[PDB]
Amino acid sequence: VNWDAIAQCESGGNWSINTGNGYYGGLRFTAGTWRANGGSGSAANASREEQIRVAENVLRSQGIRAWPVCGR
């Protein structure tokens, strides 16, 4: 799917964002969802491709419903 378009809606495109609001990275991952789908450390330090790779696992276990508005 178009992950770049989804990321723009979720964080304006900043893949390395860590506002400390509980969500990390351009796709706004929680620490739980991140690792539980094959993530190392924090999503804010993880590369774009590595974030996209973990998102593919999220999309397969939870679905596109993980991004209620930006998943469109």
Side-chain angles (χ1 to χ4, degrees):
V1 310
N2 196 335
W3 292 112
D4 284 317
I6 299 179
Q8 176 63 32
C9 171
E10 287 287 345
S11 59
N14 198 326
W15 291 94
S16 62
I17 188 56
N18 184 12
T19 52
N21 67 332
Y23 309 96
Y24 307 87
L27 287 172
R28 312 302 295 154
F29 285 112
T30 58
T33 306
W34 176 251
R35 164 139 49 180
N37 293 278
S40 71
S42 176
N45 302 113
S47 63
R48 166 182 171 269
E49 184 273 340
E50 214 265 7
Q51 290 187 39
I52 291 179
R53 194 197 94 267
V54 177
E56 292 286 352
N57 301 340
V58 176
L59 179 59
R60 193 174 47 197
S61 58
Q62 301 182 15
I64 203 60
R65 64 163 179 88
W67 304 269
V69 180
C70 302
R72 310 173 184 170

Short mmCIF file of all heavy atoms in Angstrom, two decimals:
data_model
loop_
_atom_site.label_atom_id
_atom_site.label_comp_id
_atom_site.label_asym_id
_atom_site.label_seq_id
_atom_site.Cartn_x
_atom_site.Cartn_y
_atom_site.Cartn_z
N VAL A 1 0.83 -1.20 0.00
CA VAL A 1 0.00 0.00 0.00
C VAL A 1 0.87 1.26 0.00
O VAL A 1 2.08 1.18 0.17
CB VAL A 1 -0.95 0.03 1.21
CG1 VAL A 1 -1.70 -1.29 1.33
CG2 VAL A 1 -0.17 0.31 2.49
N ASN A 2 0.24 2.41 -0.20
CA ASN A 2 0.96 3.68 -0.24
C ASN A 2 1.29 4.18 1.17
O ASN A 2 0.53 4.95 1.75
CB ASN A 2 0.13 4.73 -0.99
CG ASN A 2 0.95 5.94 -1.40
OD1 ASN A 2 1.98 6.26 -0.80
ND2 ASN A 2 0.49 6.63 -2.44
N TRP A 3 2.42 3.73 1.70
CA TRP A 3 2.80 4.08 3.07
C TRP A 3 3.21 5.54 3.22
O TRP A 3 2.95 6.16 4.25
CB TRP A 3 3.94 3.17 3.56
CG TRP A 3 3.53 1.74 3.74
CD1 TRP A 3 3.94 0.67 3.00
CD2 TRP A 3 2.62 1.24 4.73
NE1 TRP A 3 3.34 -0.47 3.47
CE2 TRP A 3 2.53 -0.16 4.52
CE3 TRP A 3 1.87 1.82 5.75
CZ2 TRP A 3 1.73 -0.97 5.32
CZ3 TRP A 3 1.07 1.01 6.53
CH2 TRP A 3 1.01 -0.38 6.31
N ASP A 4 3.85 6.08 2.18
CA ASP A 4 4.30 7.47 2.20
C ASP A 4 3.13 8.45 2.32
O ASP A 4 3.22 9.45 3.03
CB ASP A 4 5.11 7.78 0.94
CG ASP A 4 6.51 7.20 0.99
OD1 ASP A 4 7.15 7.31 2.05
OD2 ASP A 4 6.96 6.64 -0.03
N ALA A 5 2.04 8.15 1.62
CA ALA A 5 0.85 8.98 1.69
C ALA A 5 0.22 8.90 3.08
O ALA A 5 -0.27 9.90 3.61
CB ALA A 5 -0.16 8.56 0.63
N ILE A 6 0.24 7.71 3.67
CA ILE A 6 -0.30 7.49 5.00
C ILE A 6 0.53 8.22 6.06
O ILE A 6 -0.01 8.75 7.03
CB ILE A 6 -0.37 5.99 5.35
CG1 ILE A 6 -1.29 5.25 4.36
CG2 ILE A 6 -0.86 5.77 6.77
CD1 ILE A 6 -1.39 3.77 4.62
N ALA A 7 1.84 8.25 5.85
CA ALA A 7 2.75 8.89 6.80
C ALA A 7 2.58 10.41 6.80
O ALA A 7 2.73 11.05 7.83
CB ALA A 7 4.18 8.52 6.48
N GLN A 8 2.28 10.97 5.63
CA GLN A 8 2.08 12.41 5.50
C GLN A 8 0.87 12.87 6.32
O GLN A 8 0.88 13.93 6.93
CB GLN A 8 1.91 12.81 4.04
CG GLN A 8 1.59 14.28 3.82
CD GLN A 8 2.70 15.19 4.29
OE1 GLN A 8 3.88 14.84 4.24
NE2 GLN A 8 2.33 16.38 4.76
N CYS A 9 -0.16 12.03 6.32
CA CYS A 9 -1.38 12.32 7.07
C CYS A 9 -1.17 12.17 8.57
O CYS A 9 -1.80 12.86 9.37
CB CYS A 9 -2.51 11.40 6.60
SG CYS A 9 -4.01 11.46 7.60
N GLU A 10 -0.26 11.28 8.95
CA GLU A 10 -0.06 10.94 10.36
C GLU A 10 0.93 11.85 11.08
O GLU A 10 0.84 12.02 12.29
CB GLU A 10 0.40 9.48 10.48
CG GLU A 10 -0.69 8.45 10.22
CD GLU A 10 -1.69 8.35 11.36
OE1 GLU A 10 -1.40 8.87 12.46
OE2 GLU A 10 -2.77 7.75 11.15
N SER A 11 1.88 12.42 10.34
CA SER A 11 2.93 13.22 10.97
C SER A 11 3.56 14.26 10.05
O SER A 11 4.63 14.78 10.35
CB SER A 11 4.02 12.29 11.51
OG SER A 11 4.58 11.52 10.47
N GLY A 12 2.91 14.55 8.93
CA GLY A 12 3.42 15.54 8.00
C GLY A 12 4.64 15.09 7.23
O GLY A 12 5.27 15.89 6.53
N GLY A 13 5.00 13.82 7.37
CA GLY A 13 6.11 13.26 6.63
C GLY A 13 7.38 13.05 7.44
O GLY A 13 8.34 12.46 6.96
N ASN A 14 7.39 13.54 8.68
CA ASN A 14 8.56 13.41 9.53
C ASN A 14 8.70 11.99 10.08
O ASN A 14 8.01 11.61 11.03
CB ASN A 14 8.50 14.42 10.69
CG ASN A 14 9.85 14.64 11.34
OD1 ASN A 14 10.67 13.72 11.44
ND2 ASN A 14 10.10 15.86 11.80
N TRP A 15 9.59 11.22 9.48
CA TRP A 15 9.78 9.82 9.84
C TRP A 15 10.56 9.64 11.14
O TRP A 15 10.58 8.56 11.72
CB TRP A 15 10.49 9.07 8.71
CG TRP A 15 9.66 8.91 7.47
CD1 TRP A 15 9.65 9.73 6.38
CD2 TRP A 15 8.72 7.87 7.19
NE1 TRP A 15 8.76 9.26 5.44
CE2 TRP A 15 8.18 8.12 5.92
CE3 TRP A 15 8.29 6.74 7.90
CZ2 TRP A 15 7.23 7.28 5.34
CZ3 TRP A 15 7.34 5.91 7.32
CH2 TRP A 15 6.82 6.19 6.05
N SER A 16 11.21 10.71 11.59
CA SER A 16 12.05 10.63 12.79
C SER A 16 11.47 11.42 13.95
O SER A 16 12.19 11.82 14.87
CB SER A 16 13.46 11.13 12.48
OG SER A 16 13.44 12.50 12.09
N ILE A 17 10.15 11.63 13.93
CA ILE A 17 9.51 12.46 14.95
C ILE A 17 9.29 11.71 16.26
O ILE A 17 8.92 10.53 16.28
CB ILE A 17 8.15 13.00 14.43
CG1 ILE A 17 7.58 14.03 15.42
CG2 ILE A 17 7.16 11.88 14.17
CD1 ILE A 17 8.51 15.18 15.70
N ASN A 18 9.56 12.40 17.37
CA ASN A 18 9.32 11.86 18.70
C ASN A 18 8.82 12.97 19.62
O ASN A 18 9.58 13.51 20.43
CB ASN A 18 10.59 11.22 19.27
CG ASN A 18 10.36 10.56 20.62
OD1 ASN A 18 9.23 10.38 21.06
ND2 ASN A 18 11.45 10.19 21.28
N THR A 19 7.54 13.32 19.49
CA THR A 19 6.95 14.40 20.26
C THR A 19 6.70 14.01 21.72
O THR A 19 6.26 14.84 22.52
CB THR A 19 5.62 14.87 19.64
OG1 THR A 19 4.76 13.74 19.44
CG2 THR A 19 5.87 15.55 18.30
N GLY A 20 6.97 12.76 22.05
CA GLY A 20 6.81 12.28 23.41
C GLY A 20 5.36 12.09 23.81
O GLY A 20 5.05 11.96 24.99
N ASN A 21 4.47 12.06 22.82
CA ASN A 21 3.05 11.90 23.09
C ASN A 21 2.64 10.43 23.10
O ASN A 21 1.45 10.11 23.07
CB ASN A 21 2.22 12.67 22.06
CG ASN A 21 2.35 12.10 20.66
OD1 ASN A 21 3.37 11.50 20.31
ND2 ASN A 21 1.31 12.29 19.85
N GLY A 22 3.63 9.54 23.13
CA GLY A 22 3.37 8.11 23.19
C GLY A 22 3.55 7.41 21.85
O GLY A 22 3.69 6.19 21.80
N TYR A 23 3.54 8.19 20.77
CA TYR A 23 3.68 7.64 19.43
C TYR A 23 5.03 8.02 18.82
O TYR A 23 5.54 9.12 19.05
CB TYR A 23 2.53 8.11 18.54
CG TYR A 23 1.17 7.89 19.17
CD1 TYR A 23 0.52 8.91 19.85
CD2 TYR A 23 0.53 6.66 19.07
CE1 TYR A 23 -0.72 8.71 20.43
CE2 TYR A 23 -0.71 6.45 19.64
CZ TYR A 23 -1.33 7.48 20.32
OH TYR A 23 -2.57 7.28 20.88
N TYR A 24 5.60 7.11 18.04
CA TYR A 24 6.94 7.32 17.47
C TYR A 24 6.96 7.09 15.97
O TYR A 24 6.17 6.33 15.43
CB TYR A 24 7.95 6.38 18.15
CG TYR A 24 7.95 6.46 19.66
CD1 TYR A 24 7.08 5.68 20.42
CD2 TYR A 24 8.82 7.31 20.34
CE1 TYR A 24 7.07 5.75 21.80
CE2 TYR A 24 8.82 7.38 21.72
CZ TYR A 24 7.94 6.60 22.44
OH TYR A 24 7.93 6.67 23.81
N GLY A 25 7.89 7.77 15.29
CA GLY A 25 8.08 7.58 13.86
C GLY A 25 7.01 8.22 13.00
O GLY A 25 6.01 8.72 13.51
N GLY A 26 7.23 8.20 11.69
CA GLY A 26 6.31 8.82 10.75
C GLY A 26 4.94 8.17 10.70
O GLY A 26 3.96 8.82 10.33
N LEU A 27 4.87 6.90 11.05
CA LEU A 27 3.61 6.17 11.03
C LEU A 27 2.96 6.14 12.41
O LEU A 27 1.93 5.48 12.60
CB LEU A 27 3.81 4.75 10.50
CG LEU A 27 4.08 4.66 9.00
CD1 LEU A 27 4.47 3.25 8.60
CD2 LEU A 27 2.86 5.12 8.22
N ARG A 28 3.57 6.85 13.35
CA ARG A 28 3.04 7.01 14.70
C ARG A 28 2.78 5.67 15.39
O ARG A 28 1.63 5.31 15.66
CB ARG A 28 1.75 7.83 14.67
CG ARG A 28 1.85 9.11 13.85
CD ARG A 28 2.96 10.01 14.38
NE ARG A 28 2.67 10.49 15.73
CZ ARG A 28 3.60 10.86 16.60
NH1 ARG A 28 4.89 10.78 16.27
NH2 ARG A 28 3.26 11.29 17.80
N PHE A 29 3.85 4.94 15.67
CA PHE A 29 3.74 3.64 16.34
C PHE A 29 3.80 3.78 17.86
O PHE A 29 4.54 4.61 18.39
CB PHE A 29 4.85 2.70 15.88
CG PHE A 29 4.65 2.13 14.50
CD1 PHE A 29 5.47 2.51 13.45
CD2 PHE A 29 3.64 1.21 14.26
CE1 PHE A 29 5.28 1.98 12.19
CE2 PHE A 29 3.45 0.69 13.00
CZ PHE A 29 4.27 1.07 11.96
N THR A 30 3.02 2.95 18.55
CA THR A 30 3.18 2.79 19.99
C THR A 30 4.34 1.83 20.21
O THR A 30 4.67 1.04 19.32
CB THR A 30 1.91 2.26 20.67
OG1 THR A 30 1.54 1.00 20.08
CG2 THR A 30 0.76 3.24 20.50
N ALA A 31 4.96 1.89 21.39
CA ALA A 31 6.11 1.03 21.68
C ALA A 31 5.72 -0.44 21.65
O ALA A 31 6.51 -1.29 21.23
CB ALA A 31 6.70 1.39 23.04
N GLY A 32 4.50 -0.74 22.07
CA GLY A 32 4.00 -2.10 22.07
C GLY A 32 3.82 -2.65 20.67
O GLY A 32 4.35 -3.71 20.34
N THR A 33 3.07 -1.92 19.84
CA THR A 33 2.79 -2.35 18.47
C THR A 33 4.07 -2.46 17.65
O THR A 33 4.19 -3.32 16.77
CB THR A 33 1.83 -1.37 17.76
OG1 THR A 33 0.64 -1.21 18.54
CG2 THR A 33 1.45 -1.88 16.38
N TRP A 34 5.04 -1.60 17.94
CA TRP A 34 6.29 -1.57 17.21
C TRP A 34 7.08 -2.87 17.33
O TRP A 34 7.32 -3.55 16.33
CB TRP A 34 7.16 -0.40 17.68
CG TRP A 34 8.51 -0.36 17.04
CD1 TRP A 34 9.70 -0.63 17.63
CD2 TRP A 34 8.80 -0.05 15.67
NE1 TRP A 34 10.72 -0.49 16.72
CE2 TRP A 34 10.19 -0.14 15.51
CE3 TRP A 34 8.01 0.31 14.57
CZ2 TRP A 34 10.82 0.11 14.29
CZ3 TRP A 34 8.64 0.56 13.36
CH2 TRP A 34 10.03 0.46 13.23
N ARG A 35 7.46 -3.22 18.55
CA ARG A 35 8.27 -4.41 18.79
C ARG A 35 7.49 -5.70 18.53
O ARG A 35 8.02 -6.63 17.92
CB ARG A 35 8.80 -4.41 20.22
CG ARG A 35 9.31 -5.77 20.70
CD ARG A 35 10.59 -5.64 21.50
NE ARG A 35 10.49 -4.62 22.54
CZ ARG A 35 11.48 -4.31 23.37
NH1 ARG A 35 12.65 -4.94 23.28
NH2 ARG A 35 11.31 -3.37 24.29
N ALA A 36 6.24 -5.74 18.97
CA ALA A 36 5.41 -6.94 18.84
C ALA A 36 5.20 -7.35 17.38
O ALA A 36 4.76 -8.46 17.10
CB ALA A 36 4.06 -6.73 19.52
N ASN A 37 5.52 -6.45 16.46
CA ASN A 37 5.46 -6.75 15.04
C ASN A 37 6.84 -6.78 14.39
O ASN A 37 6.98 -6.62 13.18
CB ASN A 37 4.56 -5.74 14.32
CG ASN A 37 3.10 -5.86 14.72
OD1 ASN A 37 2.37 -6.71 14.21
ND2 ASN A 37 2.67 -5.02 15.66
N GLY A 38 7.86 -6.97 15.22
CA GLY A 38 9.23 -7.13 14.74
C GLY A 38 10.02 -5.84 14.67
O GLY A 38 10.67 -5.55 13.66
N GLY A 39 9.98 -5.06 15.75
CA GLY A 39 10.69 -3.79 15.78
C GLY A 39 11.83 -3.77 16.78
O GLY A 39 11.73 -4.37 17.86
N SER A 40 12.91 -3.09 16.43
CA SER A 40 14.06 -2.96 17.32
C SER A 40 14.19 -1.54 17.85
O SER A 40 14.13 -0.57 17.09
CB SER A 40 15.34 -3.37 16.60
OG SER A 40 15.72 -2.41 15.63
N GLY A 41 14.36 -1.42 19.16
CA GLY A 41 14.52 -0.13 19.80
C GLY A 41 13.30 0.75 19.65
O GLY A 41 12.18 0.35 19.99
N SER A 42 13.51 1.96 19.13
CA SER A 42 12.43 2.92 18.93
C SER A 42 12.19 3.17 17.44
O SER A 42 13.12 3.09 16.64
CB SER A 42 12.74 4.23 19.65
OG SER A 42 11.73 5.20 19.39
N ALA A 43 10.95 3.49 17.09
CA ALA A 43 10.59 3.73 15.70
C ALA A 43 11.08 5.09 15.22
O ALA A 43 11.10 5.37 14.03
CB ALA A 43 9.08 3.62 15.52
N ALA A 44 11.47 5.94 16.17
CA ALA A 44 11.97 7.27 15.85
C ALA A 44 13.40 7.20 15.30
O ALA A 44 13.81 8.05 14.51
CB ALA A 44 11.92 8.17 17.07
N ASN A 45 14.13 6.17 15.72
CA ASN A 45 15.50 5.98 15.27
C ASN A 45 15.58 5.00 14.09
O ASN A 45 16.56 4.98 13.35
CB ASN A 45 16.37 5.48 16.42
CG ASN A 45 16.38 6.42 17.60
OD1 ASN A 45 15.87 6.10 18.67
ND2 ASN A 45 16.95 7.61 17.40
N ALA A 46 14.53 4.20 13.93
CA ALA A 46 14.46 3.25 12.83
C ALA A 46 14.33 3.96 11.50
O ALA A 46 13.69 5.01 11.41
CB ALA A 46 13.30 2.29 13.04
N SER A 47 14.94 3.40 10.46
CA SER A 47 14.87 3.99 9.13
C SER A 47 13.46 3.91 8.57
O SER A 47 12.60 3.20 9.11
CB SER A 47 15.85 3.28 8.19
OG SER A 47 15.51 1.92 8.03
N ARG A 48 13.21 4.65 7.49
CA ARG A 48 11.90 4.66 6.84
C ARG A 48 11.50 3.26 6.38
O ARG A 48 10.39 2.81 6.67
CB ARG A 48 11.90 5.62 5.66
CG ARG A 48 10.71 5.46 4.73
CD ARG A 48 10.81 6.41 3.54
NE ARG A 48 9.80 6.14 2.53
CZ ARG A 48 9.99 5.32 1.50
NH1 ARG A 48 11.14 4.69 1.35
NH2 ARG A 48 9.01 5.13 0.62
N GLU A 49 12.40 2.59 5.68
CA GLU A 49 12.15 1.25 5.17
C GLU A 49 11.88 0.27 6.31
O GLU A 49 11.02 -0.61 6.20
CB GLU A 49 13.32 0.76 4.32
CG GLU A 49 13.12 -0.60 3.66
CD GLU A 49 13.53 -1.76 4.56
OE1 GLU A 49 14.31 -1.55 5.50
OE2 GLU A 49 13.06 -2.89 4.31
N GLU A 50 12.62 0.43 7.41
CA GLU A 50 12.47 -0.45 8.56
C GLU A 50 11.14 -0.20 9.26
O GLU A 50 10.54 -1.12 9.82
CB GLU A 50 13.64 -0.25 9.53
CG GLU A 50 14.08 -1.50 10.26
CD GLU A 50 13.43 -1.65 11.62
OE1 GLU A 50 12.55 -0.83 11.94
OE2 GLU A 50 13.82 -2.57 12.37
N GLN A 51 10.67 1.05 9.21
CA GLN A 51 9.36 1.38 9.75
C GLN A 51 8.26 0.82 8.85
O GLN A 51 7.24 0.33 9.32
CB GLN A 51 9.19 2.90 9.88
CG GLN A 51 10.04 3.52 10.98
CD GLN A 51 9.73 4.99 11.18
OE1 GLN A 51 8.57 5.41 11.12
NE2 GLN A 51 10.76 5.78 11.43
N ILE A 52 8.50 0.89 7.54
CA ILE A 52 7.56 0.37 6.56
C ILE A 52 7.46 -1.15 6.67
O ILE A 52 6.39 -1.73 6.49
CB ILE A 52 7.98 0.78 5.12
CG1 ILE A 52 7.80 2.29 4.93
CG2 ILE A 52 7.17 0.03 4.08
CD1 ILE A 52 8.20 2.79 3.56
N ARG A 53 8.58 -1.79 6.98
CA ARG A 53 8.62 -3.24 7.13
C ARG A 53 7.77 -3.70 8.31
O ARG A 53 7.07 -4.71 8.23
CB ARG A 53 10.06 -3.73 7.31
CG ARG A 53 10.23 -5.22 7.12
CD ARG A 53 11.55 -5.71 7.70
NE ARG A 53 11.40 -6.20 9.07
CZ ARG A 53 11.58 -5.46 10.16
NH1 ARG A 53 11.92 -4.18 10.05
NH2 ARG A 53 11.43 -6.00 11.36
N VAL A 54 7.85 -2.97 9.42
CA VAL A 54 7.07 -3.29 10.61
C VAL A 54 5.59 -3.00 10.37
O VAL A 54 4.72 -3.68 10.90
CB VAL A 54 7.58 -2.50 11.84
CG1 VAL A 54 6.73 -2.78 13.07
CG2 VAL A 54 9.04 -2.83 12.12
N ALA A 55 5.32 -1.99 9.55
CA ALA A 55 3.95 -1.62 9.21
C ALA A 55 3.28 -2.72 8.40
O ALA A 55 2.07 -2.92 8.49
CB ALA A 55 3.94 -0.31 8.43
N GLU A 56 4.08 -3.44 7.62
CA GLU A 56 3.57 -4.56 6.83
C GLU A 56 3.11 -5.69 7.74
O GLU A 56 2.18 -6.43 7.40
CB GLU A 56 4.65 -5.06 5.86
CG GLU A 56 5.00 -4.08 4.75
CD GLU A 56 3.93 -3.99 3.68
OE1 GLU A 56 2.98 -4.81 3.71
OE2 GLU A 56 4.04 -3.11 2.80
N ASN A 57 3.75 -5.82 8.90
CA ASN A 57 3.35 -6.82 9.88
C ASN A 57 2.09 -6.39 10.61
O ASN A 57 1.22 -7.21 10.91
CB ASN A 57 4.48 -7.06 10.89
CG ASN A 57 5.76 -7.53 10.22
OD1 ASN A 57 5.75 -8.04 9.09
ND2 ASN A 57 6.88 -7.38 10.91
N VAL A 58 2.00 -5.09 10.90
CA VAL A 58 0.82 -4.52 11.54
C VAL A 58 -0.40 -4.65 10.63
O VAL A 58 -1.50 -4.96 11.09
CB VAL A 58 1.04 -3.03 11.88
CG1 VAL A 58 -0.22 -2.42 12.46
CG2 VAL A 58 2.21 -2.88 12.85
N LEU A 59 -0.19 -4.43 9.34
CA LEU A 59 -1.25 -4.49 8.34
C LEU A 59 -1.79 -5.91 8.18
O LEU A 59 -2.92 -6.12 7.74
CB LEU A 59 -0.75 -3.96 7.00
CG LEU A 59 -1.70 -3.95 5.81
CD1 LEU A 59 -2.93 -3.11 6.11
CD2 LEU A 59 -0.99 -3.44 4.56
N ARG A 60 -0.98 -6.90 8.56
CA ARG A 60 -1.32 -8.30 8.36
C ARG A 60 -1.94 -8.92 9.61
O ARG A 60 -2.59 -9.97 9.54
CB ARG A 60 -0.08 -9.08 7.93
CG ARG A 60 -0.33 -10.48 7.40
CD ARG A 60 0.95 -11.08 6.87
NE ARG A 60 2.06 -10.90 7.80
CZ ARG A 60 3.34 -11.03 7.47
NH1 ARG A 60 3.69 -11.34 6.23
NH2 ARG A 60 4.29 -10.85 8.39
N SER A 61 -1.75 -8.27 10.76
CA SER A 61 -2.27 -8.78 12.02
C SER A 61 -3.47 -7.98 12.51
O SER A 61 -4.39 -8.53 13.11
CB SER A 61 -1.17 -8.78 13.09
OG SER A 61 -0.65 -7.48 13.28
N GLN A 62 -3.46 -6.68 12.25
CA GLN A 62 -4.53 -5.80 12.70
C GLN A 62 -5.38 -5.31 11.53
O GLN A 62 -6.59 -5.17 11.65
CB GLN A 62 -3.96 -4.61 13.47
CG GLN A 62 -3.15 -4.98 14.69
CD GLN A 62 -2.64 -3.78 15.45
OE1 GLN A 62 -3.11 -2.65 15.24
NE2 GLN A 62 -1.68 -3.99 16.33
N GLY A 63 -4.72 -5.06 10.40
CA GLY A 63 -5.40 -4.54 9.23
C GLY A 63 -5.13 -3.06 9.03
O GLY A 63 -4.33 -2.46 9.75
N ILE A 64 -5.81 -2.47 8.05
CA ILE A 64 -5.64 -1.05 7.76
C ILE A 64 -6.39 -0.20 8.79
O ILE A 64 -6.28 1.02 8.81
CB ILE A 64 -6.12 -0.70 6.34
CG1 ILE A 64 -5.46 0.58 5.83
CG2 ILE A 64 -7.64 -0.60 6.30
CD1 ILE A 64 -3.95 0.50 5.76
N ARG A 65 -7.15 -0.87 9.66
CA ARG A 65 -7.90 -0.20 10.71
C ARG A 65 -6.99 0.38 11.79
O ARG A 65 -7.44 1.08 12.69
CB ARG A 65 -8.90 -1.16 11.36
CG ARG A 65 -8.24 -2.32 12.08
CD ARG A 65 -9.21 -3.01 13.04
NE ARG A 65 -8.58 -4.14 13.72
CZ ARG A 65 -7.92 -4.04 14.87
NH1 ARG A 65 -7.79 -2.86 15.46
NH2 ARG A 65 -7.37 -5.11 15.42
N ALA A 66 -5.69 0.08 11.69
CA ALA A 66 -4.71 0.60 12.64
C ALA A 66 -4.47 2.08 12.39
O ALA A 66 -3.99 2.80 13.27
CB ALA A 66 -3.41 -0.18 12.54
N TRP A 67 -4.81 2.53 11.19
CA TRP A 67 -4.75 3.94 10.84
C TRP A 67 -6.13 4.40 10.36
O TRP A 67 -6.37 4.51 9.16
CB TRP A 67 -3.69 4.19 9.76
CG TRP A 67 -2.32 3.71 10.15
CD1 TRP A 67 -1.35 4.43 10.80
CD2 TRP A 67 -1.77 2.40 9.94
NE1 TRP A 67 -0.24 3.65 10.99
CE2 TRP A 67 -0.47 2.40 10.47
CE3 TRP A 67 -2.26 1.24 9.34
CZ2 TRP A 67 0.35 1.28 10.42
CZ3 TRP A 67 -1.44 0.12 9.29
CH2 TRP A 67 -0.15 0.15 9.83
N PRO A 68 -7.03 4.67 11.32
CA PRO A 68 -8.47 4.92 11.11
C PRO A 68 -8.79 5.96 10.03
O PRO A 68 -9.78 5.81 9.32
CB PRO A 68 -8.93 5.42 12.48
CG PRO A 68 -7.98 4.82 13.44
CD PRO A 68 -6.66 4.80 12.73
N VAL A 69 -7.96 6.99 9.92
CA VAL A 69 -8.25 8.09 9.01
C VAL A 69 -7.22 8.20 7.88
O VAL A 69 -7.56 8.52 6.74
CB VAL A 69 -8.31 9.43 9.77
CG1 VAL A 69 -8.60 10.59 8.82
CG2 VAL A 69 -9.37 9.37 10.85
N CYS A 70 -5.96 7.90 8.20
CA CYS A 70 -4.88 8.05 7.23
C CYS A 70 -4.66 6.79 6.40
O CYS A 70 -3.98 6.82 5.37
CB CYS A 70 -3.58 8.42 7.94
SG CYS A 70 -3.69 9.94 8.92
N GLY A 71 -5.24 5.68 6.84
CA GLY A 71 -5.09 4.41 6.14
C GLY A 71 -5.82 4.39 4.81
O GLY A 71 -5.57 3.51 3.98
N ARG A 72 -6.71 5.35 4.60
CA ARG A 72 -7.46 5.46 3.36
C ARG A 72 -6.54 5.62 2.16
O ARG A 72 -5.96 6.69 1.94
CB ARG A 72 -8.42 6.65 3.42
CG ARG A 72 -9.29 6.68 4.66
CD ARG A 72 -10.07 7.98 4.72
NE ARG A 72 -10.85 8.08 5.95
CZ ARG A 72 -11.47 9.19 6.35
NH1 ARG A 72 -11.40 10.29 5.62
NH2 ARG A 72 -12.16 9.20 7.48
#
